[PDB]
From a paper:
CISs are macromolecular injection devices with an overall structure that is homologous to the contractile tails of bacteriophages. Their conserved modules include an inner tube, a contractile sheath and a baseplate complex.
The dome-shaped Alg16A cap complex covers the inner tube, and it exhibits an ~11-Å-wide central channel. Each Alg16A subunit interacts with three Alg1 proteins from the distal inner tube layer (Alg1-L22) and terminates the tube. Compared with homologues in PVC/AFP, Alg16A is much shorter (197 amino acids in Alg16A, 293 in Pvc16, 295 in Afp16) and folds into a single domain with a C-terminal extension. Interestingly, the cap adaptor Alg16B mediates the interactions between the cap complex Alg16A and the most distal sheath layer (Alg2-L23). The cap adaptor expands the outer diameter of the cap to ~164 Å, with an enlarged inner diameter of ~115 Å. The Alg16B NTD (residues 1–213) is an immunoglobulin-like domain flanked by three additional α-helices (α1–3), whereas one single β-barrel constitutes a C-terminal domain (CTD) (residues 214–284). The Alg16B adopts a parallel arrangement with Alg16A. The N terminus of Alg16B interacts with the C terminus of Alg16A in a mimicked ‘handshake’ manner, terminating the sheath assembly. Moreover, the tube lumen was empty for all observed particles in AlgoCIS ΔAlg16B. Together, these results showed that the cap adaptor plays an important role in stabilizing the cap module and the most distal sheath layer, and its absence results in mis-assembled particles.
Residue numbers in the entry:
A (entry chain 0A): 1 to 197
B (entry chain 1B): 1 to 284
C (entry chain 1a), F (entry chain 1b), I (entry chain 2a), J (entry chain 2b): 2 to 142
D (entry chain 2B): 595 to 690
E (entry chain 0F), L (entry chain 0E), M (entry chain 0B): 149 to 197
G (entry chain 1A): 172 to 284
H (entry chain 1A): 58 to 114
K (entry chain 2C): 644 to 690
């Protein structure tokens, strides 16, 4: 569900640029580290805003939750679900430096007003063939501002030449295969034996 | 045991000041609806003025179930009414009952930007002519649909001042700008709160108080170039506006190299007040 | 489900502003009573609850012009008299509605601490207050 | 007596928003009053939970219609102590 | 140590420079989410428990 | 509004220079009195304010030629006598006017500490003073 | 005494007809487990869209159901009463069930743009 | 609850349903351990936890 | 099974209030009469019960505005007359009902001791009374 | 309701000053007369009130330049004559008004004790007096 | 409750005082008054 | 550790070098913001409170 | 901080990646160093010291 959540998020920002009548600003999903790589990918990145994934973590408070199902007089056993947090970047790469600072204000203004995204909230195209696996979702967006030591770590793995950027933290993508390991019947007879010891 | 109540608006008062609401030369009173709303969004009367009831007023309001609410541009009083209706006060009101509210200032620069000669005088507003020991003229608190600003017509001195302060039973520490007194029945039907049978009026009374701003001549001082210049006409002091001065013709004795200079607008922190012109000194 | 975060909250304390920077000290604790008689085949003690205790609450916020609320509450101490207030602290969701509420009775301040003044750094001024109280009830429904 | 105090507690909200933040504050004010009366011996019950209850809010005391009209509904119950009036003394001879 | 962090993300070759800190840009869309009416009627019910 | 910063300030202490490096110790504190009788249905205590306390104030600045002010104030101690002074500490805005003022009565110094001498580093000399006093009032209006 | 009851369910061993009973005439458990059902319906409403910055309001022509997880797509001018001049650039979200106006005739859900 | 204890009747729940179960005589499938009578009954109460029930129902 | 604690109790003494901070002296005692005659094979004495004794009872509590009861009871003494009272002391359960009761016959005030005063002392003013009586019965059923 | 504290008080003793650091000995006491006759079914005694007693009162304060009052009162003793005074002791409220008053009849100085001296002792010189009297009445209305 | 002191623009001073070079200080004090006449009323006790 | 920070912002290839610390360059525009006159009249008012 | 260490030894330009930890590969040559016979006779000698 990593690609489908980020594809949905890309469409919501592009819809907000349309309502403001800005026909030059578009967000693209690619990776920031290849902006000046000069091998076949950099021509797609020019004069655009780029959204990328920089880190993955695991939610600890939900790690030991069980996932068994009881129905009738029968139990099916399943493995516990995996829950993942993301860390994202919006990197502005416009031709003019003044135009990049205007697009970063719009992205900061958009998430100030709307922070919760559900299957009923969003306006992505449900009929599209690449989106046939998505059913129900809910995630929040939260602004993240790093210190000077943390910026050196982040841009140290992306080249060493920064760009105007904002950082966000995404909550709870659920990953689960939902496969069955076993089936058994429940307890229906109890026998007790006593002896004098 | 069931208990019920119902409350309705009783009286509204509009509190305005040009220093915060005007934009340079543009007068708030002449703004259209969008312009008016825009200016109001940045205004809060509590930034400079404090308003509260006297001890007797508080006691009465408790007895008659009258409440005091406030908003960034106004004060609204509300009253308990009989269940099942809109206009019958729970408790009977009488014509000569009244409420007294006191005004005091928190903004130390009020006197620099407000165009009103308050030296040694009491500011007084009401909807009914007072009985004072010395001859005086009187005008009521203005209604919402009337023009004008607070002026000398509302100031009292000497014995008349002494009398009003005593009747209001004010604290020895003083520090009072003025007194507002509203009677249930005033000098004319349009200033009253209730009808002849005690019924609340069917159009909420809506009164207004509006203060004007001071104007001055701007003087520009350039010590390094050793030159001084003044503007030809007075300009208003405002909090948020901006006046652009960019012609040689705007000034008296403009500098040789006028084209390279920038002329900032003055603040209201320091000002010279004289019987004729007021002056604001700006350093370059 | 989804766990709650702890950066969106409000405090109703009888002042004008409800925005703070940190809250701590919301605890409950009971003392213990122990007993053993000499004929018991276990060589350890049995345990009971006894008397109860509450800890002090600390509140922190920034310093602003024309807001002397901390000192105005502390100035109501006259010998054994003080103005006691009710205190309501809520954790909020994304549409700013309460989820977990802490309800405090009979609070009054005992320590007011101002900022320290330093020349070299770039730092804002923080003021802090410590409160004594007589009970706490947690509501999460 | 109890009504005078409770009334003052709810009058503070005459022109306030009718929402969850208000409902929580109203309830907390009323319960603190009643707890103190219980502590002083006015009310019956081993713990406050047995002496009184207070209910305020959408789904408890209010519906959509009340939100629309602008009503706030508060429900309160109290365990109040009753006196003895008649003392009967029965006498007899002791058997032995 | 801080200069090494700053110029580490700008190339690694410094220039004569001064640094400044700007205070309080306000960002706000100022959009409306909801509208409701205030409290105007209060009802209290008492029972003997 | 806009929060205040803590690097621009001044101290009026009866000396020639008003520029310092740091100030600390501006606190107010009240002791607590507790009570319970045996018939109470709550098993915790009720709380009252009692006697009040003030803490010592520390001031620090740099060492300059021909300025022995710290030692001149400390040298006025003669058995139980000292020169007691009023102390006024202000936090300033951008046009150098007071915003928050701490007003101290009956101050006298009890500890004067000189710099330490080290050969290897590059450091300036700092002197420090600790003051006892009998009351503090905060004014922010 | 604290009330707070929505309703009461009462089941008798022997009901008003054999198909609602739990046991047979001789006390034997039935050979087909009794299986009863309770099902609650959902409310419908007219959706109203409010655009303050453009100063325009519009409403749908017919009521739609409130659901927790579904989605209704509104994308034709013909779906609305007095649709906006630049309809093609707008997106119309589905309403929540947190606030609703209930009247003797229609129910309404207000959505801000 | 008192009756259910006496007659050995248990209450179980699932995400979409409630099932009651009863102790029976050893060796069979359909004879209740304790004799049941026609007019015995069980009463269950319903209450709500969701504050928005009334808006959507 | 667990033992009872000793902090929840009440005292009925014919006064307005039943709360106290301390109760002590609920003792019973008898004398011993010893005997030996010269021909006994044992060189120890035989013992039997003598006359009965009781200890005085001490009650303590804090002082309150307008509560002058300890002094008013004491002041009923007139040469050889005094107002005598039945004193009932009870240890309570969680329902605030009696569990263990001490019944005391004919009590009267021997001594009343007032609060000491200290310029630097932070504490509650405590008063105390010592009572004489003619008998104690203990009930625990 | 809260109890009274014990640190704010004043003493009127016919001297220039009313401040003290310590006051003690405000006690009341009576004797007990016991009786039993041989035929009584009980083996305990019956008790009734005897004669009255009072304790001496101790007052302490610091010493001051030119205040020689304790010595001047003591020095009024001449064989069997002495200047007797009415002593009034009062516990004060927040308005500095009396709440609880102890009224003492005919006091006179039994003993005056001066300050001890120590080469290495850092402290206040304290002096004390012990007074005889003929009766105590307690008022709390 | 014993005293007050007021000094400053907007409290005791105006723009005109700043111009002239004046400083205005306002002070109030609560001062204690003596008793002069003590009247003793006597009567018989009723009983 | 400090040499690694310094040459990290100058290229990463050191040269024979010495380091010095200079004290007190004074920077001041020396411009006037305001002019006023000093206190020459004092008035005191007393009241019985 | 750990991602900076890992990609610092792989080039300095990251790619979308996941990390895993594998447990217990057993490495053993299973060669013989020596062979001996076990204890079958015990003798004890005592003396008076």
């Amino acid at each position: 569900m990593i690609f489908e959540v980020l594809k949905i998020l890309t469409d919501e920002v592009n819809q907000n640029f349309k309502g403001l009548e800005m026909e030059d600003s578009e967000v693209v999903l690619n990776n920031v580290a290849l902006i000046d790589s000069q091998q076949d990918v950099a021509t797609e990145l020019q004069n655009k805003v780029i959204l990328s994934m920089i880190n993955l973590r695991e939610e600890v408070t939900m790690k030991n939750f069980p996932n068994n199902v009881l129905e009738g007089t029968k139990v099916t056993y399943k493995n516990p679900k995996l829950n993942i947090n993301l860390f994202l970047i919006f990197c502005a790469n416009r031709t003019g430096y003044k135009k990049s600072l205007s697009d970063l204000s719009r992205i900061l203004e958009f998430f100030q007003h709307k922070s919760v995204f559900t299957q009923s909230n969003t306006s992505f195209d449900r009929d599209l063939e690449e989106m046939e696996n998505v059913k129900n979702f809910r995630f929040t967006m939260e602004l993240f501002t790093p210190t000077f030591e943390e910026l050196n770590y982040i841009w140290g793995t992306l080249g060493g030449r920064q760009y105007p950027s904002v950082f966000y933290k995404l909550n709870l993508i659920v990953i689960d295969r939902d496969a069955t390991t076993s089936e058994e019947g429940v307890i229906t007879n109890i026998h007790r034996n006593y002896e004098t010891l | 045991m069931q208990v019920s109540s119902s409350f309705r608006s009783f009286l509204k008062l509009d509190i305005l000041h040009s220093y915060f609401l005007n934009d340079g030369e543009k007068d708030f009173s002449s703004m259209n609806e969008e312009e008016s709303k825009t200016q109001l969004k940045s205004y809060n009367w509590k930034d400079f003025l404090e308003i509260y009831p006297s001890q007797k007023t508080s006691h009465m309001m408790r007895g008659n179930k009258i409440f005091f609410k406030s908003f960034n541009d106004s004060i609204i009083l509300a009253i308990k009414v009989e269940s099942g209706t809109e206009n019958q006060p729970f408790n009977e009101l009488y014509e000569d009952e009244s409420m007294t509210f006191l005004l005091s200032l928190k903004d130390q620069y009020f006197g620099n930007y407000t165009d009103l000669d308050l030296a040694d005088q009491l500011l007084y507003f009401s909807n009914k002519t007072p009985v004072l020991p010395e001859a005086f003229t009187f005008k009521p608190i203005d209604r919402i649909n009337q023009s004008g600003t607070v002026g000398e017509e509302y100031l009292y001195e000497g014995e008349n001042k002494k009398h009003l302060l005593e009747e209001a039973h004010l604290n020895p520490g003083g520090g009072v700008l003025g007194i507002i007194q509203i009677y249930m029945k005033g000098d004319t039907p349009v200033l009253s709160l209730i009808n002849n049978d005690g019924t609340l009026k069917n159009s909420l009374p809506h009164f207004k108080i509006h203060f004007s701003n001071r104007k001055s001549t701007w003087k520009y001082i350039n010590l390094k170039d050793d030159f001084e210049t003044e503007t030809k006409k007075d300009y208003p002091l405002t909090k948020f506006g901006f006046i652009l001065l960019d012609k040689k013709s705007d000034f008296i004795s403009p500098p040789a190299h006028f084209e390279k200079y920038v002329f900032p607008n003055p603040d209201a922190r320091r000002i010279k007040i004289t019987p004729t012109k007021n002056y604001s000194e700006i350093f370059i | 489900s989804y766990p709650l975060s702890k950066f969106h909250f409000s405090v109703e304390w009888g002042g004008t502003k409800i925005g703070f920077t940190e809250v701590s000290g919301l605890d409950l604790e009971t003392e213990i009573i122990e007993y053993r008689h000499g004929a018991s085949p276990e060589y350890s003690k049995i345990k009971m609850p006894g008397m109860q205790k509450f800890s002090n609450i600390t509140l922190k916020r920034g310093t602003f012009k024309s807001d002397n609320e901390y000192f105005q509450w502390y100035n109501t101490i006259n010998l054994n008299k003080v103005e006691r207030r009710d205190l309501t602290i809520s954790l909020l969701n994304e549409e700013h509605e309460p989820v977990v509420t802490w309800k405090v009775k009979n609070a009054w301040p005992l320590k007011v601490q101002s900022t320290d003044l330093k020349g070299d750094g770039n730092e804002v001024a923080i003021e802090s207050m410590e409160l004594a109280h007589e009970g706490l009830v947690i509501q999460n429904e | 007596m109890a009504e005078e105090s409770i009334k003052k507690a709810t009058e503070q909200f005459v022109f306030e928003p009718n929402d969850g933040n208000t409902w929580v504050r109203v309830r907390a004010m009323i319960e603190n009053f009643l707890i103190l009366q219980w502590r002083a011996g006015a009310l019956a019950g081993a713990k406050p939970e047995h002496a009184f209850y207070v209910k305020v809010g959408l789904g408890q005391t209010m519906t959509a219609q009340d939100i629309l009209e602008g009503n706030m509904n508060v429900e309160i119950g109290l365990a109040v102590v009753r006196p003895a009036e008649f003392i009967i003394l029965k006498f007899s001879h002791k058997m032995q």
